[PDB]
Amino acid sequence: ASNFDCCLGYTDRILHPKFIVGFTRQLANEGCDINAIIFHTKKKLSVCANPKQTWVKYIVRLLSKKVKNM
């Protein structure tokens, strides 16, 4: 069965690293039937980030590339 079921209702904002301290990606083949990026705000709220939007694509690129430089 599906472990979890990703957020079926997304958001329409431009959230930033400015507000993000966490991130959980949801695919349509791991459990959910749809795919939603979960950006965890510094406000303890899970944002249903649309995989459709570039600000999301941008943040998820950085969130996948946490290379330890500093």
UniProtKB/Swiss-Prot annotation:
Upper taxonomic lineage: Eukaryota, Metazoa, Chordata, Craniata, Vertebrata
The cysteines covalently paired via disulfide bonds are C6-C32, C7-C48
Species of the source: Homo sapiens (Human)
Q: Which domain of life is it from?
A: Eukaryota
- This protein is called C-C motif chemokine 20
